Design a protein around this ligand. Structure first.
Ligand code: CLA
Ligand code: CLA
Ligand code: CLA
Ligand code: CLA
Lengths: 156, 155, 157, 163
């Protein structure tokens, strides 16, 4: 079934959305620790009115639940030599969700699933392993569990 | 001596949060002016399109009126500099950067909101107006010898 | 008695020294945590051949043990609106040794004392409260104890 | 002929050296501008007594002049997903010397040549295009000159052994 935004409208591919915590402000690029600059991790900003860095969703025009999708940050500047596409830091113990994935490759595929109670609330799951958060340098950072509830706000 | 209006045409209120958005990239934010100064912070225009800016509250020494002494203070849950979030002029610098750390009750921190050019709800900060200069992180607010702004209410 | 450098020579005021851990490289400015940029703390660099940021010692020309001295970083550029003089962050729980002190004021007075093993090895003590270290953002940061952080003074050639 | 260090001793491969400006302190990693974090550029530190970040030299045990060598930073921490080996940023207009090269590949080969009068003073040349410097974010950054291999805009260097 269709993934809905905060206005209850269906999510469209190639459309800009803030991924906002459903449970501070939105989700943003920040480095995971002082040992890694690139690629970047995804942290919840502690600043109350910051909407997040927008993302576009792509499918290998509706975004449906339980289907393979790829999340890519939308930014006019990017200081890392790799992509803005979310992926899993396989090497790390923490299993941080990091940038630099290939949006056409399976290493970058997540699934948007419904999350408990409230409407328009979702979780990211990787194939069942869900995306959660861990305390890190800049605040809560997205990690692959062995769930971090999110909403999608349309960028007006 | 008429009311300053926000982007919705509503009058500005003191002790209310507003994004100061360029009228002319996203809103106005704290960033350091160059690699020689960390504190206090300057005010730069973010190059990221949907960043609203760091909110400010306006205070008067409840309406904010044009051509009256006001003080602009950043609203932030964290502040890593040992001084205030109140805008003021970096007197020492050649560039005359608008910097944080002013005293909101003191005259060193008084600006006046004046009408700018054509469009409604467009203003400037002032007979020396606030403009911008190229700096480290992008356009930084400076005192001229005008940088047009709108006030968006933080909903 | 005179404080000696790593060459066994007496320390002189207004002379540049690296304060090197006696126990990684020398002592350097870094911020203590992500909530404070200025003033700066003093951390031990984890990079093996970095000598530290040099300091000059001042007295309110010989530097003697158990006498009031003030430590001031020597740097051509300084991005904080305060001094390069070491002092104690009174407000913090950790009691970080921070920059921004007044070198003529008592808030900035430390005493160089002999430390245990080996010649030319010293500790900083504040009036007895000694200077130790704590884990912080960038690595071990100098703090005032209630574990003394042993130091040598290397002359800057 | 052998490249000599600041003590006049011949340079050895797999040995740590500070590359110090012959002409501020030594050469260090810093980003080139606010648009690039990785890979890193090479800047001259403006802090007088900072020796530089040490490098080891490798040859595809003596380091000789006018022979292909590769310069690799020696560092306990490295936050970029690529190597510590110097190479040329081909894409950039400035032609910054950047990290992330392959030390066994030709993209990373420099040649150490004599510079001017004074002994133990050298330049880096790429095959004749010499390494110079340009004003950048953190200070003078190493760049590849266009040059007919002269010492005019070449960035003169000494090698200090890390004791
Ligand atoms: C808020 C400002 C600030 C911050 C965050 C730092 C942070 C640091 N300083 Mg310091 N420093 C400052 C102000 C600051 N300093 C000032 C004003 C001076 C006088 C000019 C100095 C003089 C100084 C000296 C002489 C040295 C340091 C060193 C260090 C590092 C100690 C950690 C380490 O040994 O390995 C970690 C080191 C790495 C290089 C790994 C990279 C770490 C991650 C990816 C973050 C990138 C850091 C980046 C450059 C941030 C800008 C801060 C910059 C001043 C370093 C750390 C990067 C030591 C050092 O290591 O130099 C590089 C050192 O020798 N400092
Ligand atoms: C290495 C790269 C890097 C780093 C370190 C950061 C860091 C951060 N990003 Mg991000 N970001 C990046 C890349 C980076 N990002 C890229 C490439 C983009 C796309 C262009 C973004 C887009 C982005 C957006 C849209 C937002 C952030 C935000 C944040 C902040 C989240 C935590 C917070 O709530 O701060 C709140 C606290 C502060 C801002 C004060 C910080 C405390 C002091 C001043 C520390 C100063 C740094 C110190 C010297 C150490 C330097 C080390 C560093 C080199 C690792 C944090 C400052 C959010 C934010 O808060 O914006 C400011 C936010 O909305 N990011
Ligand atoms: C030393 C202190 C300091 C520094 C260096 C900065 C720097 C910056 N701030 Mg600010 N800020 C500060 C203090 C600081 N701020 C404080 C105390 C607050 C109140 C909490 C804020 C609140 C704030 C907000 C709300 C916003 C900023 C934004 C910005 C950016 C404006 C330029 C841009 O559009 O880049 C965009 C380009 C990038 C993010 C990628 C550049 C790659 C560089 C080379 C690496 C930079 C890493 C990291 C962001 C630097 C660490 C410093 C950190 C404090 C931000 C710039 C990165 C805007 C922003 O862009 O958010 C991130 C923004 O919306 N600031
Ligand atoms: C992106 C990563 C990064 C960045 C930005 C830097 C930047 C710098 N490095 Mg390097 N370095 C790195 C990675 C990095 N390095 C790595 C991975 C290593 C190996 C572990 C090193 C090893 C190294 C050594 C050994 C040395 C440096 C030094 C320097 C400085 C050279 C300019 C100078 O003389 O300042 C002098 C002036 C100051 C240090 C005071 C300026 C303080 C400013 C205001 C801090 C700015 C913070 C602000 C939030 C903006 C940050 C932007 C950032 C996000 C890009 C500069 C701060 C030299 C140095 O000077 O020591 C720190 C030095 O000796 N580097």
């Amino acid at each position: 079934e269709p993934v809905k935004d905060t206005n209850g409208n269906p999510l469209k591919i190639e459309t800009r959305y803030f991924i906002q915590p459903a449970s501070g402000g939105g989700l943003v690029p920040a480095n995971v620790d002082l040992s890694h600059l690139c690629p970047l991790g995804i942290v919840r900003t502690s600043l109350p009115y910051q909407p997040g860095l927008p993302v576009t969703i792509s499918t290998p025009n509706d975004v449906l639940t339980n289907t393979n999708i790829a999340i890519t940050f939308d930014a006019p500047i990017w200081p890392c030599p790799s992509s803005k596409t979310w992926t899993v830091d396989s090497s790390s113990e923490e299993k941080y969700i990091i940038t630099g994935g290939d949006p056409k490759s399976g290493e970058s595929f997540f699934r948007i699933e419904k999350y408990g109670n409230g409407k328009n609330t979702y979780k990211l799951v990787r194939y069942g392993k869900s995306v959660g958060s861990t305390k890190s340098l800049w605040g809560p950072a997205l990690v692959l569990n062995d769930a971090f509830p999110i909403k999608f706000r349309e960028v007006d």
